[model samples]
Target: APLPTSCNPSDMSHGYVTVKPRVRLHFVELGSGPAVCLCHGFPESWYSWRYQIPALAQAGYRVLAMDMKGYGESSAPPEIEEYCMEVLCKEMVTFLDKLGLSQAVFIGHDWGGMLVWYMALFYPERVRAVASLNTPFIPANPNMSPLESIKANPVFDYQLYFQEPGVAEAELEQNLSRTFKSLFRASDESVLSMHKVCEAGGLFVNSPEEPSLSRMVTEEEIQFYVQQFKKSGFRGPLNWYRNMERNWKWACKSLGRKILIPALMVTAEKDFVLVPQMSQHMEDWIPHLKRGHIEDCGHWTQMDKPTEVNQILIKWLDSDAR
Candidate 1:
């Protein structure tokens, strides 16, 4: 079947469904088979799956992709407490329940990966198989993993600063345009690189102190992001970081629990965010794990290497685990 052209203005190819229940979650549901739930990470929305939607749906799995609490059309609660690990993870479970799904093949990246990890642990029966892009499970309640551990790596430092109250929002809101520009130019070095991954915390680093930078995305993409974010600010998304200690503490109790379900962890080779080295120890935790490394990609692996990501996901979905 051809990709659906009648998707909501979110540029999704998936069909539609009302996933959030009371709150309206911007989601694109496509294809049909066993249920597959795709979750988005920080600073991104369900829109991230634009490339994967049609492919997954075509594979005979009902792909349900939702805008997480802070991004796109999802509910953006104002308080940090609202974004707690238990709360956010519950929202996912509730999403599944609301859809009348007993279980789903769960896939996610970044914060979304974190949610999937906890979900599998909290309710292993609810997850059929897990395919995570870029990020992995590191115990729900993180450990004394040391701030220096993240600082040494460009990807983890951003979460450290994001854990700080009110700072990221103030800086990001003060210069939204500049921040977007920096993020755009991050992959394009020819355009006078003004953003430094190590310095700015995580991504889309913006500052008036830096020189003016050219736009990263085309007019339409920028307009979409600007419009979506105009309503949902950085607060809800950043709250994922605040739960670091909470997740850390919680993970301690579930240390030996291995994922018996089929699990796939896609590692983006050039990903400055969730680097390949991070998953070095993943095998010890995940018993039934299959790993794939895709080169020429970044944190946005779904889009950065859509065909590869799609092929890998499709293959895994049909693998022996099924």
Candidate 2:
């Protein structure tokens, strides 16, 4: 069949579905076979999965990459509570139902990964299998608020800066192109020292005067991301960070829950935010967990090392572990 009315068939196509009474989510998809839902993370659209979409599709899987409610062309509700993980997960379940799929292999990165892990915890039956890149399964520690939990780990101090509205958003929206370029730039373990991140005044607060820089994606691609952000603005995306307390409150409901689904976690060797060490104890919570690492790669696993990430995903998805 031809691509959906809103999508571009050659690479991937886009479409929209009314997932809730007052909300609609825009998604892009390609290929045919078993369903695989791809979810992108902070400050990104379905385009972040540009490489994996075609590759997975060619591997005989129907790939669905969605622009999470607040990003890309999806509905960006102004309410901060609307971006809570509980609400987001419900939207995802409804999104799957609208697509006529009972279950799908959900692959996520960054905030996307966090959301899928919640999916398996809250609605295990909706996921056939789960894969996360650059993010790990950290069950809620009921004792701490989400802000407190992140602050407990000094590496994530940036989340503290994001907890407040208007601070990060104002700084980022001031220069959309520069913001995307800086946030998406490459980093090695050495460059991303926790102390340096703090000294710089947070993750997204680099100098706007510096020239645009990126190691993985091209200038044209960066421009495209900039254009998309110009439309969505940073408020909706920032709301994800703002809801740490809300997500923590919701997560408290599943204090000792284990994600029974077959799970895979791909860690980027040099990801400062999501270091490989984070998954060291994941096997305990995710009993069926399988782990892999992309050497010399940064936070953006799928984008930084597409081929390696794909190999890991293909092997895991084809396995009978589930």
Candidate 3:
């Protein structure tokens, strides 16, 4: 049977692997052959990859769509330090070892893109190759902490709003289902960028409601996301935003490093947050890199343009290193 809910774990055979005393991961496993692990970004879990998992699996990959650390059926520790990049990289490496995977191509979207990029840099042996949607392989800044960098930019105030403990989540969790609805709709007029929403109103409060469904996502699909976040709570996932300095500090080991492995970054044309020009200079750092652009796409590249996303990924998977 096809999945009743878009992101339901029961639809496909799934399993859990414990990384540390406090962390456990839930993954949706499909197909077999070379491994292709899907890591999702903020406000999303395995459910975020509803489109790419099956498509990549059909293209001869052992697709494992995972609910990374703090989202979905995974453990979300109360400690903010538990979500740092070093801790996350080691945790994923351990996850690979426990699952009997020597290495796998890590394909990620948004925050997952960041993690997968870090995995390639810190644990290249554990990563066969890396592909990312939106987020680029940002070099570590030796001059200042990521927070300092964010504070310098006015457009990134949304990220800054997330830095406070409980303030962001309290606003987010007030209306859980509405949170999923509004987030999924991501408008051309976004509070995320301008001073109106992230500055004065707090996040999610100003975004329009999802009382109805539209082209981007179905009402049922939004429920699946709401269901996942309701259990894990926004704190764990939101905690990811709170770890810039921690990640910056640990990233010192890989500073001045380039992603030597095969790298593919698919940029969305309409994604203002991680714009197309942002990825223009990636070749300076990544030697074996290929870039794809999805016409009129958004931050949710896989969701907004799944067919094109799949076409690019399958072509790369077939031609790139196995």
Candidate 4:
């Protein structure tokens, strides 16, 4: 059988479908078999899985890597109200349904990682198994809103700064090259301390000098991201953060419930954002969970150490997940 291919953002071979009402998605598809859906996190597109898409396809699994709503060629709703964990999770389920799949192995990285945890917990039937990179399933506190929980410390200052509409986006859109370069750079200065994020001015304000970093992504890849982001802007991508309180209220009922589905948590040793310590007790919340660690890798686990990440995923899918 042949799948119809279409071009909107024409740099890559891919397809699109209105997965849900008013929300069409763009995705890169390769190979065929039991489905494997890759969900990328904030400030990224399906290209984040450039390595995994081919590896998983050759490894005998159908790979569908889609740009989550708000980034790349996907639809971006104007309202922040539309981007909750509930809405994002349900949208993914519809995406699977439209592809003729009843269930799929869900693999997410960064913000995508957080969403996959939501999928396993809220709509377990649509997920065959779950593998998340960097981010972990933190048990929710029934007492407070998620925003408040994260706000307790200045370590989360960046997240707090992201809460306001248009604030961070202004900084982000100011310099496309600088934003991507400095943010994606691998170093120790990132894990900000003592409210320096907000106190020193948002994200990159303190650095007037060009960081001049490299090695994470190529100039071509940087240009691709710059063009894609320019087309979409930052509004839709930043909207995801504004829904924390709403998601907290909606998710409180499922607190402390162990995920019964087979799960994998892949932690990056140097991913300061979601430190390796964050996943320490994932076993306490997941009965059938396996853990994999990639040493010397930062936040972009899949991209940084694609080979090691691929080995872990393919090995687990062949063994435990089969």
Candidate 5:
């Protein structure tokens, strides 16, 4: 049966677990065997894992995809401090504990990718292995806050706009559905110009009434994302950008650290924002790292090229590293 517009809580296929006082995380679970946890990035939810979850489950693994804090069904803490890397990392470790999982293979995309990288750095014991799509592991520079590092380069100027509270939140929320369609579109050279848009204090100079959809995402998927955002509001998710300095402070712990666990980084040829060049030096730091590049794919690699992404994941998981 098609789920009611509100979704069905009783379906074991999906449910919520309270990880901390008033901090509940919603997850979609499937199959059985070794555990694999999926963490989504900004402006996305557990639903982003829809394709991977079923594929992994069919491969005889227990797959769990979580809606990160301030997104989807997860609890949103109003305090900005509550969204720090230290807090988010601990919440994930505790989520593992509550799930009776001492260790699990963690896979992430975008902001979620950044989180799992931190997990391997701070809580390696809880991560059997880690994989990231698009996002790469960059060793923390003791001299710079992530914001400063980003602003030093004009390419990421959009982040500066995001750092300001209420501005992006208001602009994005004003037309939530259009925002998702525009942001998640197919990769192109125009993305580099996005920083210019941010510098001008707007997301879009002339926002689309109905933005173009990506080749991979259906109208139904966009509606699902729209519905979730309409309920949660953009404030919680936008708060993530506001904590860059705090994340930089906590990253001091990673000064001399390298992720000892096996790692896989899949880069998309079309993902200009997360260019393959960004990960060139990764092999220098990650002793057990394997890299893959999907031709014609963009930032949303899993969604843009699910078969390639899934095949890569399955192949890596089957390796002795598991």
Candidate 6:
């Protein structure tokens, strides 16, 4: 079942996290217990949490799934600065405060994982328990070159180009439908195939139309992305990449800060987005961590294989993942 009260301003699944600021944050809430907030990743919305909400709620916890800025029904701030890690992290704090939550279980996937990492470092007290899917919070290092490091792994090398001004605006805007498809599909076979061939191949290689992405995603889902993004174009979403340097700067300062609460980390075995190495070092950074790896899933673990993800999370709560 859904929450008794609708979270969106329009009472739609799509609404603002901050109704006053007009900064939208589309979310769906359900169940009741100690609050648990779930955040989505890049090119995705709260819809990504489809499998986890009910599972968590049935396990007796209030679930708050947010779209985060720039994607889905959330407010897409025009300026690149608005999407900075600090500001986004503050939004999480504000989201909890606005909803009357003292501290909640924090969970993230992909970019959301990145946010949760920063959240633990910046606001330890506000996070009772922390869990991540795929992406890990590596203290951003300025000495590390985003481009050269991922070059051997061209799937990630795309971030370097995204960091370039006007690249996402130009390429993604032209093929908005394709962009969402390539990023949000739920199939492991397709994703692995795309990773091996099309990810670095010429399929979406600056093409105005993304044929592969078009084939992967459904029309209904594609329209949702096109409608929300076509309004201001990709500048808002793409700004996430522009904030890399600033994020790196912030990470350097946050590296010393460690997590002192119950923590969970889950990853898809075939996820090309942020591979095993990305999350492996998390134990070093997180003092108390319970990590799990799924054998047959992709980046969208919560959706691609929710049953497995749910079991892992539930196991952590039951056994304490000691």
Candidate of highest TM-score: 3
Residue 9 C-alpha lDDT in model 5: 28
Better of 2 and 3 by TM-score: 3
Q: For candidate 3, which ten residues in a row score worst on lDDT?
A: 1-10
Note the residue pairs that clash in candidate 6.
16-25, 17-25, 24-75
Give the range where candidate 1 is weakest over 10 consecutive residues by summed lDDT: 186-195
Which of 1 and 3 is the better model by TM-score?
Answer: 3
Ranking by TM-score: 3, 5, 4, 2, 1, 6
Stretches of model 4 off by over 4 angstroms after superposition: 1-12, 188-195
For model 4, residues 132-185, the per-residue Cα lDDT tens digits are 999999887877767667877556778888888998899899988877777765
TM-score of 6: 0.82
- How does model 1 fare in lDDT? 0.70
Computed on alpha carbons, the lDDT of every model, listed in order, comes to 0.70, 0.80, 0.82, 0.82, 0.81, 0.70
lDDT of 1 by residue, 159-262 (tens): 66666778888766665555554454324332222235336453444334453444323556545666777787778777877865555656676767777777
For model 4, what is the error of residue 140's alpha carbon versus the real structure, in angstroms, after optimal superposition? Answer: 1.9
- Identify the superior model by lDDT, candidate 3 or candidate 6: 3
Clashes of 6: 3
Which scores better on TM-score, 3 or 6?
3
Q: Candidate 3 lDDT, tens digit per residue, 1-322?
A: 1231233457788889988877898899988889999999988878788878888878899989999888889999988988888888899999999999999999999989999999999898989999999998777778887767876766577887788889888888888877766666545534344344554758665556644454688777877888777886988898888888778878877768887999999988888777778787888888999988898687777777778888899999999957
**lDDT digits (tens) for residues 1-322 of candidate 5:** 2221222224548767888888998888888888999998888878877778778877778988888999887898777777887898899998988888899999999999989999988999999999999999988787876766886776677778887678888888987778778777767622225567664768675556766777667788888889888767888888877888788878887767778889999898988778888888887778999988899888777777787887889899878235
| Pairs with steric clashes in candidate 4 | none
